[PDB]
Amino acid sequence: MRLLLVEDHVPLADELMASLTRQGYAVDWLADGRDAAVQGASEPYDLIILDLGLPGRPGLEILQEWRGLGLATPVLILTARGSWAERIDGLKAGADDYLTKPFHPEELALRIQALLRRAHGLA
């Protein structure tokens, strides 16, 4: 099991890494969308966590590129406070689920669990 976390804000990345570690996951962290676009398509991950708040190339364009390459990896997007549009647009772009910032770690855990469960058809 291995996750990719794409998160530019270091304090948030550090918190997410700690939380994901407490949940039992090995995680690779990338802060830059250019790096993430390549690595997400090239390296085996069970799940990618993609913050839509990345500077530079929009996260949703990165996600669309991945889907156009046939990437079937589960993607959980982190969306903006109060943005219903980002959740809808993110699903349309090919996200499997989302979590609205600021979020609670229990909800992070539950949504990741469910994606990983369905990905393997686990009970």
CATH number at residue 63: 3.40.50.2300
Query: Residue 28 forms beta bridges with which residues?
Result: 4
Half-sphere exposure of 102 (CA within 13 A, CB side): 2
Does residue 42 contact residue 30 with C-beta atoms inside 8 Å? no
**Count: domains in the chain:** 1
Give the whole-angstrom CA distance, residue 99 versus residue 103.
7
CA dihedral 78, 84, 85, 87 (to 10 degrees): 40
Q: To what resolution in angstroms was this structure determined?
A: 1.3
Q: What is the extent of the structural domain holding 30?
A: 3-120
Question: In this structure, which amino acid lies at residue 11?
Answer: P
- Amino acid at site 36: A
Solved how? X-ray
Q: With breaks defined as C to next N over 2.5 Å, after which residues does the chain break? A: none
Query: In this structure, is the dihedral angle defined by the CA atoms of residues 121, 20, 2 and 70, taken in order, positive or negative?
Result: positive
